[PDB]
Design an enzyme around this catalytic site. Structure first.
Site, PDB file in Angstrom:
ATOM      1  N   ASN A 159     -21.884   8.583 -32.308  1.00 46.55           N
ATOM      2  CA  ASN A 159     -23.028   9.155 -33.003  1.00 46.55           C
ATOM      3  C   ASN A 159     -23.995   8.098 -33.521  1.00 46.55           C
ATOM      4  OD1 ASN A 159     -23.291  12.068 -33.112  1.00 46.55           O
ATOM      5  ND2 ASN A 159     -21.301  12.097 -34.186  1.00 46.55           N
TER       6      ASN A 159
ATOM      7  N   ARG B 276     -18.141  25.402 -30.391  1.00 47.37           N
ATOM      8  CA  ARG B 276     -17.947  26.000 -31.706  1.00 47.37           C
ATOM      9  C   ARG B 276     -18.734  27.289 -31.825  1.00 47.37           C
ATOM     10  NH1 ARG B 276     -18.304  20.545 -35.437  1.00 47.37           N
ATOM     11  NH2 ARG B 276     -16.046  20.126 -35.504  1.00 47.37           N
TER      12      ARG B 276
ATOM     13  N   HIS C 149     -28.009  17.137 -30.807  1.00 49.07           N
ATOM     14  CA  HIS C 149     -26.681  17.393 -31.318  1.00 49.07           C
ATOM     15  C   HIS C 149     -26.697  17.384 -32.839  1.00 49.07           C
ATOM     16  CE1 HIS C 149     -22.430  17.132 -32.123  1.00 49.07           C
ATOM     17  NE2 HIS C 149     -22.610  15.974 -32.741  1.00 49.07           N
TER      18      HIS C 149
ATOM     19  N   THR D 113     -12.616  14.578 -37.341  1.00 48.43           N
ATOM     20  CA  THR D 113     -12.515  15.647 -36.361  1.00 48.43           C
ATOM     21  C   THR D 113     -11.917  15.032 -35.093  1.00 48.43           C
ATOM     22  OG1 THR D 113     -13.710  17.476 -35.285  1.00 48.43           O
ATOM     23  CG2 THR D 113     -14.790  15.369 -35.368  1.00 48.43           C
TER      24      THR D 113
END
Ligand SMILES: NC(=O)C1=CN([C@@H]2O[C@H](COP(=O)(O)OP(=O)(O)OC[C@H]3O[C@@H](n4cnc5c(N)ncnc54)[C@H](O)[C@@H]3O)[C@@H](O)[C@H]2O)C=CC1
Ligand SMILES: NC(=O)C1=CN([C@@H]2O[C@H](COP(=O)(O)OP(=O)(O)OC[C@H]3O[C@@H](n4cnc5c(N)ncnc54)[C@H](O)[C@@H]3O)[C@@H](O)[C@H]2O)C=CC1
Ligand SMILES: NC(=O)C1=CN([C@@H]2O[C@H](COP(=O)(O)OP(=O)(O)OC[C@H]3O[C@@H](n4cnc5c(N)ncnc54)[C@H](O)[C@@H]3O)[C@@H](O)[C@H]2O)C=CC1
Ligand SMILES: NC(=O)C1=CN([C@@H]2O[C@H](COP(=O)(O)OP(=O)(O)OC[C@H]3O[C@@H](n4cnc5c(N)ncnc54)[C@H](O)[C@@H]3O)[C@@H](O)[C@H]2O)C=CC1
Ligand SMILES: C[C@H](OC(=O)Cc1ccc(Cl)c(SC2=C(O)C[C@H](c3c(Cl)cccc3Cl)CC2=O)c1)c1ccccc1
Ligand SMILES: C[C@H](OC(=O)Cc1ccc(Cl)c(SC2=C(O)C[C@H](c3c(Cl)cccc3Cl)CC2=O)c1)c1ccccc1
Ligand SMILES: C[C@H](OC(=O)Cc1ccc(Cl)c(SC2=C(O)C[C@H](c3c(Cl)cccc3Cl)CC2=O)c1)c1ccccc1
Ligand SMILES: C[C@H](OC(=O)Cc1ccc(Cl)c(SC2=C(O)C[C@H](c3c(Cl)cccc3Cl)CC2=O)c1)c1ccccc1
Lengths: 323, 331, 331, 331
Positions: free
Chosen positions: A129, A160, A184, A239
């Site tokens: 990221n 999701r 994103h 995560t």
């Protein structure tokens, strides 16, 4: 002779280039979840891990190797040195630390040339990221053609979204179709027009779908997607499982040349009135040469505007980065 | 009508009881690896998670749920309360006390027995007919503890036992021989861990005995030092702990393989811990690993392995030690 | 503009080549069984079918194609021209003439040889680096023939050999013992079929030798007549032919198992037919089944099984008989 | 002592009523292709085959059993007697008469009804709580027939219906677009076969409607002849019969997909035939294909597809025709 020579007659030693190799750079919770999901899906005949933290790297490698009996990937290697990554078809980057962007850019400045040195023909799949910027960075540094640089993008966002959709409707996610696209994360776009079960458009049945005049507030579903991320981090500190599965799904289409359609980050210059070198998620066809095609989703003015706004901010940051 | 009612006509709302449910109790590194491996092997129509740390438990559940699209297990649930575990075919216990001894004034056997004292009756309440698969350490003592507290028949309490030991051994063996571990057969039995027993006589490829080709195998006379293979299994455990702080991927893969035989009623043979009274001159209520036939009833049968006098003495010594500890336990 | 171009913007266009192509030659009962098994195990990114019966070929191809939605093999092609087979990693030969009334097996051989004289050169032409897997009967002879015609090194010529004999043996063994065939180890070796050799010394569960436990195992003295288990393997072949007219599912699955190790470079050990000149006193160019290590280079290694005098004599007998036929074959 | 008892100590003599059992009735090409597909997808822990031709039945069972080593479905049985089918979760009917040259599809129906008069009560006798999945043609009528004879609630009687038509359609669509069929969505609904209805409005990639992009999609005036795709679905049926004599692989694969949702309670949405009275102005007890949610209780919900006026008229005409036939059938 040795026991081995008493037991086994050799016909040839001639070892060969690994034919279906995958590398995972970065053995944090994300990379290792990618590794495990890729292993249990029998996508690679060799798996290489790379990190800068030498102890953990050896540990993870050994732990995986010890499961060999139950797998079908005959060679698992790891190292600080990129020579372990030689001849990867697919190299997946999950390594990482505004200022955060430059640090990850500086990390990529070290990683990408090394990867390209040892697997010049590989596809690059970027997870680190912020993924859309870092896919750009990967593309810029590698010099690869756009088809060989895939960003995870909204793959997780969409998965999701479909889980949450499936919950509301009482239907398996597989049969609940809907696309989250664009940038994103926080700024992603839920394309209400494409949401459907069995080709029955939900928007058509319910034209206020996803607007603020929507009695049922399906907007909340998209919002729940973004809140979910913060919650999972708050609850368990990271995560892992969902991103890992989502990444293996992309690896599957690529390694097996399936040409399925996935929401991933790609060079969006020329689309939706965007003129800068930015990567955003659209539905892309994935195969052995990476992203060969993209789907031209019909977006509303408001949806185009969100995409445009994301692109402006991404380019704003990108132009100031130091390579 | 809502959008849901417009889209979907319902025929009935009845029933909804799981046919192939699995529960994992204790969502640490081991538990979650067991969970992911089980999900990716499509063994369950429902997965339940339990722990005492409520935030971690919810986060883990959500994370697995968010991967639903890539799985074929349509329902994943979790909670502190054991009502989420009702009607499980197989319940896997990976719960245990933290490693830092200062967390408690009790030793690990004691802490983990008190933990089982809390877990086991609650599992039994909600899944009286489940098979129990015990991972928590020391696994042989704790399998006995699960058996004592549950009241279950012997066949329905299965200890992970020497399953990981054997998997590691075959990995290392496959490395020396240049053969996939699937075709490198060898058994590590008895007490899980330090005191496990590599059964040299059974080590083979394609039915060709390594001990026969190479009679020094496993002895100190052996010039290829094959004994070191078993020594490396033991050292591996401590090394992986030093390197990453825990082990997860191998144990989790090994647990899913047992769950596969159980859920699918395969009657494959695995090295797992079972009540061993009646064998090897062992006359106490102890659990040790021997090769067991695993199916929908748990351990339905065990294989009677011919051991050397040394191997037999080692198993006997472990049984003596284990029972020595177990006889002093208070239920 | 087409709807395709309206819907989809192309980034690049280059025709790519399959990375994991497999060809099946002969789309009879056996060929199509291999095909469906290979498709369902995700072993290939491209499957090619070849036969001389043109309508059946197209129909079989179409039928498979129509299941694409449920598969992960993106391209399936067929044709009588071998250009459809270009760059196969693995080519499976299941082509075979139909034995006529009053036709002997000896006679059949030359007829299958003539088929191979056409097929093999065409295969080698378009995939010079493929592994050849021979199923056509009599399989040991035709493996040799395939080797002779192709000029391939022996590692890339593999006969299905005693792989099916061994699968049937282990199924029957499992039924006798109440254990999954996966856990019942036992090797049928030598010449495929009537004259195959059950290696009693290698039969075991969990490394426990059945012969050690039961010395009369496989001898006439055997009160339990374990020798009849091997006899049933042979009789089962004839019985399946009698009952349903051909054998398909078991052979197809056994072939897919070999394909799996080859395409995935597993280095598992399987009973397949290989060049065994130099072993057991055999001097002739003959192929017989021993356990072989299978990977991306075909048979990289073979296991040297310790045979008793009788066992060796039976392999040597097969070799002499096979050579006696082979010396008279017209290439 | 027998060798088995010397080798193995038994803990308990079993045996549980079947837990995840599937029966396939009729072991022709369709039935056996469903069998192999079900077996290679690990959907059942026990599989039963029934037919009236006994040698064929036995041979097929033995052939499957011989593949056990490569499968994970440990019990495979067969019999003319339906006691072999006891306690099946799911019973798949693929039995039928051979349609003779010059026989109308009309009285073909009644010949198949006579078959069902014997089959259905037998299935109900031994698995009164199973789901029925009907494949035999004409499938919409015979699904109605199984419903009436069985006495089952409508949720437990499922027709293969347009499952195969839709899979062919999506293959063809995928071919044109250069996209995997999994990513090419499109529904063929109504009456299986000749009179099926391609629903142009739902056809899409990534939620992008092809009809919206291309208003001529589905019309005769369409320059790109997309209507020919649905035409090719029905033409490919007659073509495959012409070329290879029967269909097997694709129907088999499609049935396994349905079986997977049922056995695993997936609640995926499939185009299958269900009792449609009350919808689309249809006022008779007829079965037509709509998207249905499949899970452990069979069809629990159906998707209410928005149809155009002439799509509606097409369903209603099939309804009228099917009902016209059914009310003349003799039970
Ligand atoms: N694209 C998406 O949808 C998602 C992206 N992510 C991102 O994935 C990345 C990783 O996540 P985590 O595993 O939780 O982070 P982490 O910090 O736990 O793991 C990062 C690993 O990268 C390693 N690393 C750092 N510099 C390196 C270098 N020069 N060479 C090799 N390795 C290096 C670190 O040592 C560390 O082990 C993060 O950036 C995270 O934000 C996470 C979830 C979803
Ligand atoms: N048998 C074998 O071959 C192996 C066994 N193990 C053992 O497995 C156990 C777990 O390993 P780790 O995951 O690393 O430990 P961990 O500490 O990371 O996880 C333990 C979990 O149990 C939970 N727990 C504690 N009390 C509980 C209770 N009353 N009810 C429910 N949950 C409770 C904790 O909250 C924690 O989440 C350890 O005892 C370890 O030694 C580990 C590797 C191999
Ligand atoms: N090694 C083993 O364990 C087993 C071997 N087999 C052997 O497999 C062979 C075939 O078995 P089935 O499929 O049952 O026979 P089959 O008659 O159904 O199929 C044979 C196919 O070979 C085709 N063929 C003939 N000449 C050809 C050519 N020049 N090029 C391409 N294709 C050609 C035929 O047209 C036919 O389609 C037989 O030789 C049989 O004995 C069968 C079972 C087991
Ligand atoms: N719904 C769909 O999409 C498709 C349906 N089909 C249908 O499936 C059916 C079967 O196809 P095939 O296997 O090719 O036909 P087949 O004639 O080759 O096999 C039928 C089997 O049913 C058996 N049978 C007949 N009466 C029986 C009884 N009273 N009890 C048990 N078994 C009995 C026969 O002995 C025969 O073995 C046909 O009706 C065909 O039309 C075929 C393809 C697709
Ligand atoms: C891009 C991301 O922030 C967002 O926009 C929130 C968001 C919304 C919707 C979705 Cl589907 C995801 S997926 C996901 C991530 O991308 C990373 C998340 C995360 C991590 Cl790994 C660590 C700390 C915080 C966060 Cl939010 C976890 C996680 O679930 C994330 C970010 C995080 C850290 C640095 C830079 C950017
Ligand atoms: C039984 C075990 O000690 C041993 O005998 C060492 C050993 C030898 C051979 C094998 Cl195959 C294993 S498998 C294995 C474990 O069983 C747990 C190990 C471990 C953990 Cl999880 C935490 C702290 C220390 C260790 Cl050794 C990791 C690991 O790899 C372990 C023990 C650990 C903690 C408490 C009580 C007993
Ligand atoms: C080698 C074979 O005959 C044998 O030795 C008997 C035998 C014993 C043990 C096993 Cl495990 C098998 S496997 C097998 C075959 O190899 C072919 C069999 C067969 C077919 Cl396909 C067609 C006609 C007759 C037969 Cl026996 C079926 C089948 O199950 C076969 C042969 C057949 C035709 C020509 C030449 C040789
Ligand atoms: C209902 C069916 O006729 C049709 O409507 C043609 C059609 C159109 C579209 C599709 Cl997807 C299919 S799938 C399919 C079948 O259902 C059976 C077909 C078939 C067989 Cl098995 C045997 C003889 C002729 C045919 Cl057409 C093969 C095959 O591919 C079939 C029928 C066939 C025989 C008796 C009664 C009815």
């Amino acid at each position: 002779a040795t026991l081995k020579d008493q037991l086994i007659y050799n016909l040839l030693k001639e070892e060969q280039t690994p034919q279906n190799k995958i590398t995972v750079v970065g053995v944090g919770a994300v990379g290792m979840a990618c590794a495990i999901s890729i292993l249990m899906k029998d996508l690679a005949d060799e798996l290489a891990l790379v990190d800068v933290i030498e102890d953990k790297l050896k540990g993870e490698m050994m732990d995986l190797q010890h499961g060999s009996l139950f797998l079908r990937t005959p060679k698992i290697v790891s190292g600080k040195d990129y020579n372990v990554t030689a001849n990867s078809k697919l190299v997946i980057i999950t390594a990482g630390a505004l200022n955060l962007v430059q640090r990850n850019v500086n990390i990529f400045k070290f990683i990408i040339p090394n990867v390209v040195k040892y697997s010049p023909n590989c596809k690059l799949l970027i997870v680190s990221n912020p993924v859309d910027i870092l896919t750009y960075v990967a593309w810029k540094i590698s010099g690869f053609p756009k088809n060989r640089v895939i960003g995870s993008g909204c793959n997780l966002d969409s998965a999701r979204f479909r889980y949450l959709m499936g919950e509301r409707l009482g239907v398996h996610p597989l049969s609940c179709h809907g696309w989250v696209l664009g940038e994103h994360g926080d700024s992603s776009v839920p394309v209400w027009s494409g949401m459907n079960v069995a080709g029955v458009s939900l928007k058509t049945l319910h034209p206020d779908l996803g607007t603020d005049k929507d009695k049922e507030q399906w907007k909340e579903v998209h919002k729940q997607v973004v809140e979910s991320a913060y919650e999972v981090i708050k609850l368990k500190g990271y995560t892992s499982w969902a991103i890992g599965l989502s990444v293996a799904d992309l690896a599957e289409s690529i390694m097996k040349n399936l040409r399925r359609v996935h929401p991933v980050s790609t060079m969006i210059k020329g689309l939706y009135g965007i003129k800068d070198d930015v990567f955003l998620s659209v539905p892309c066809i994935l195969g052995q040469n990476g992203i060969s095609d993209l789907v031209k989703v019909t977006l509303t003015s408001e949806e185009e505007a969100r995409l445009k706004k994301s692109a402006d901010t991404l380019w704003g940051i990108q132009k100031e980065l130091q390579f």
